Design a protein around this nucleic acid. Structure first.
Lengths: 52, 98, 161, 116, 166
RNA sequence: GAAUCAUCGAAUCUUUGAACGCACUGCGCCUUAAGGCAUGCCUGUUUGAGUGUCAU
RNA sequence: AGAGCAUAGCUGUUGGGACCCGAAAGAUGGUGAGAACCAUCUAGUAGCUGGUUC
RNA sequence: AUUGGAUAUGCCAUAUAAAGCGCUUUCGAAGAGUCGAGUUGUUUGCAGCUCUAAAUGGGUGGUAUCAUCUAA
RNA sequence: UUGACCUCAAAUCAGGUAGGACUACGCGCUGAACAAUAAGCGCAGGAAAAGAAAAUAACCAUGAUUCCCUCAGUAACGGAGUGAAGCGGGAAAAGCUCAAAUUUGAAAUCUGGCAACAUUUCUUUUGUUGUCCGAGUUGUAAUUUCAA
């Protein structure tokens, strides 16, 4: 094994932003939250926004 | 505000300027004292054996012989031409006296 | 692994541990007291300079700056004069007020004559008049130091004040 | 022989700390000196304006700053560069003058002997 | 000044005066040791312009090296080994004959207080200048290893730089 | 004031080894058991010599 | 009336010890007494041999 | 307990001094067995050998005169 | 005879310094097979080396060095292979000291001894002042470094 193996991998900045936008959108769906293991069955609303 | 706009373009309007001469470019100019010192040293110190050969060749005409000898020892022809002019002046100054 | 490092492992002597590992830590400010008082030890040096109303660089910046919020003819250059610039923040005003008040306090730039200087210029004035300095300098007996007209004029001016 | 770059994030942080260590030493003054504006020396880039090394002695003289005090207030001096055109002279004299318009120079204490 | 006359006279390297003196002095220098102390430089103009000052802590040593590596560089390293407490400052050619080339080396004592208190030669006291002649940091050493500015005068190429994100 | 403890600025640190009085423990020298006694080089000090050059 | 650029995977291919293993080179520097022995260059090699995992 | 750079404030300050910027009917020194030429190797550089300079000279470039630089 | 100077000496005279070790990273002198490599030899430091143009360029010009990216696997050499550099973008930026011109109305310079006075990372370290001797006119200071 050698240290100069490829450890870091590039992604187009637009692809990173697409995935982050797509992951924020998925966080607004209660059904996708339940399928990821979150116990949000008593949360009052999704998206959940609190005061400042 | 202080800050440089590092992009392109500043204006194609151009006008030349007149610059003076830098003191470094004055190198090679001959000083009055330096020329005096060189003339004193040239007399005090003798002449090289090859310089004596060139001087005795110049005296008995044989200019092509002197030029060929000076070029052979010094190298380039420019050095040889300068030595002939210098040694010719040495001969004339001496011949005016002794 | 090295025999030196194995040697100190086998020893019963403790290691010369030093604890200096704390990143994210920014150097504390010494030098100007006004800057130190108003410095924010968490913010970066660019964020502190901008808050204090100073310039961290008189040139361009070699990257993108941080955007935290969605914001809503030779004659007339060598001869024009720019009347300074406003102080944006209070910190700059303290720096400017401190500078002018110290310059006013340390403003005595007039040298009074000494015992020798007073006698030297007095002998020259009482003989060669007051308005003629070139003749004063050309004197050899009274003006032994061979001061020129400018130095004798300065000796006169300092004598007055 | 392979040059790895595992210390690339470490060098980024080390240089940032040098900037902060410098700013800690010199509190109110900028961490860089003011550079002139020059033109790159080729037909490909001569329309661009980039940063130079220092200001020429003719630029400093026109702006009113002597070459002995220019370095003391953070103005670099380039004895090598010269102003071949009146545009370069005007572009960098104004740069110096704008720099001097925004400059607060703190006074220094001077020794004044009691006698003459 | 009299150093303008000495500098100009040294250019006439084999005039009547210079050839006679070089022949006479070569005979004397061969009588003494290979490396021997010089009471004063034979070329006070050349030593002066190479950094030598007639004050305590400045030492002049003469050496002959056989003709037939650079000869001046060999003179500097042998003299520097001979007096290992001194720092080699510079060197210069003084004479040569059919068999030998003669050089004088200017050495500086970094422990003398006249050297350690002179800011113009203070730099030589620092340990980074220990045996400059052995690392090619003298004038002839720099010239010998092609150190200079211009187009007239490898490890970073034989490497393969592999960035993180590549 | 315990410590097979920590810190650590003071003392001690056998014979060797660049290893240094000569061999390599003997064999020595000088001075007052102790102090010492390697080599090269640099600055100075002191004592000498020279048919060296000059002055009286 | 432009179709490319970037990243990832796959496959092929060319180099790096380059699927693993198997013959002594030669050279440099030493040890002991021509020859011998030791350590590194050096993963210098096998047109091949043997092996190569649900 | 050690020390950094500053600040403020006393006491001294050998200033008959020392600097920057104006001006010129006055001056302006610049590194040699080195550059270079020829010939042998190593790799244009370096070195040996024979010879050996110049003062608006010398180096290096674009001209194929101009530009740039000021080595030992 | 004595003295000045020079030269050669000597001294267990006083005060200093060098060697050896470690060498991952410096810089040198070398040097095979197959690489300007290994090995050999020499010399350093916390970095080393380099460094304020006898540098580029041919432009509206740039402006010490070093390092990174790019130039570019390009030009060139020699088809293969070897393989840069100027520009450009970044990191960091800092500039200077002498030789060569008479201080000549004043060797203005420096080491050492001795004696005091301080001072300390420190009774262990550093100086200052005074005096004497020495160095130095075959040149030690101030002044100047071409950007002038």
């Amino acid at each position: 094994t050698k240290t100069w193996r490829k450890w870091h991998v590039k992604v187009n900045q637009n692809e990173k932003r697409y995935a982050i936008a797509s992951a924020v959108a998925a966080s607004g769906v209660p059904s996708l939250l339940l399928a990821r293991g979150h116990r949000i069955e008593e949360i009052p609303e999704v998206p959940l926004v609190v005061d400042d | 505000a202080p800050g440089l706009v590092v992009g392109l373009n500043k204006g194609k309007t151009l006008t030349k300027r007149q610059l003076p001469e830098r003191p470094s470019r004055r190198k090679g100019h001959l000083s009055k004292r330096t020329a005096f010192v060189r003339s004193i040293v040239r007399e005090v110190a003798g002449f090289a054996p090859y310089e004596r050969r060139v001087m005795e060749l110049i005296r008995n005409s044989q200019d092509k012989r002197a030029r060929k000898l000076a070029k052979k020892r010094l190298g380039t022809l420019k050095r040889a031409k300068g030595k002939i002019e210098e040694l010719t002046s040495v001969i004339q100054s001496s011949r005016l006296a002794h | 692994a090295n025999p030196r490092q194995r040697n100190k492992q086998r020893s019963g002597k403790p290691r010369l541990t030093r604890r200096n590992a704390n990143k994210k830590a920014k150097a504390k400010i010494y030098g100007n007291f006004v800057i130190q008082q108003n410095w924010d030890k968490h913010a970066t040096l660019r964020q502190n300079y901008a808050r204090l109303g100073l310039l961290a660089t008189p040139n361009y910046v070699t990257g993108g700056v941080e955007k935290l919020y969605p914001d809503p003819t030779l004659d007339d250059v060598l001869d024009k004069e720019i009347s300074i610039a406003p102080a944006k923040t209070e910190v700059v005003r303290q720096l400017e007020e401190e500078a002018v008040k110290k310059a006013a306090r340390q403003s005595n730039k007039m040298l009074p004559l000494s015992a020798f200087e007073h006698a030297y210029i007095q002998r020259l004035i009482n003989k060669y008049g007051t308005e003629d300095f070139e003749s004063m300098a050309k004197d050899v007996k009274l003006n032994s130091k061979l001061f020129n007209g400018s130095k004798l004029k300065n000796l006169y001016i300092r004598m007055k004040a | 022989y392979v040059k790895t770059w595992f210390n690339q994030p470490g060098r980024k942080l080390r240089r940032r700390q040098a900037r902060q260590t410098k700013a800690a030493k010199i509190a109110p003054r900028p961490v860089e000196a003011i550079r002139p504006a020059v033109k790159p020396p080729t037909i490909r880039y001569n329309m661009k304006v980039r940063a130079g090394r220092g200001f020429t002695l003719e630029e400093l003289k026109a702006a009113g700053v002597s070459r002995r005090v220019a370095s003391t207030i953070g103005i670099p001096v380039d004895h090598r560069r010269r102003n071949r055109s009146e545009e370069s002279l005007q572009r960098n004299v104004e740069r110096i003058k704008v720099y001097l318009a925004h400059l607060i120079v703190f006074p220094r204490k001077a020794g004044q002997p009691k006698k003459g | 000044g009299a150093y303008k006359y000495l500098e100009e006279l040294a250019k006439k390297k084999q005039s009547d005066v210079n050839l006679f003196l070089s022949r006479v002095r070569a005979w004397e220098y061969r009588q003494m040791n290979v490396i021997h102390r010089a009471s004063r430089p034979s070329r006070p103009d050349k030593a002066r312009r190479l950094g030598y000052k007639a004050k305590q802590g400045y030492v002049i040593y003469r050496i002959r090296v056989r003709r037939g590596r650079s000869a001046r560089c060999t003179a500097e390293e042998r003299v520097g080994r001979y007096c290992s407490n001194l720092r080699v400052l510079n060197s210069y050619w003084v004479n040569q004959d059919a068999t030998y080339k003669f050089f004088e080396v200017i050495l500086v004592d970094p422990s003398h207080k006249a050297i350690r208190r002179d800011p113009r030669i203070n730099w030589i006291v620092n340990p980074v200048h220990k045996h400059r002649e052995s690392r090619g940091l003298t004038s002839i050493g720099k010239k010998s290893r092609g150190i200079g500015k211009g187009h007239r005068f490898w490890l970073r190429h034989n490497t393969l730089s592999l960035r993180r994100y590549r």
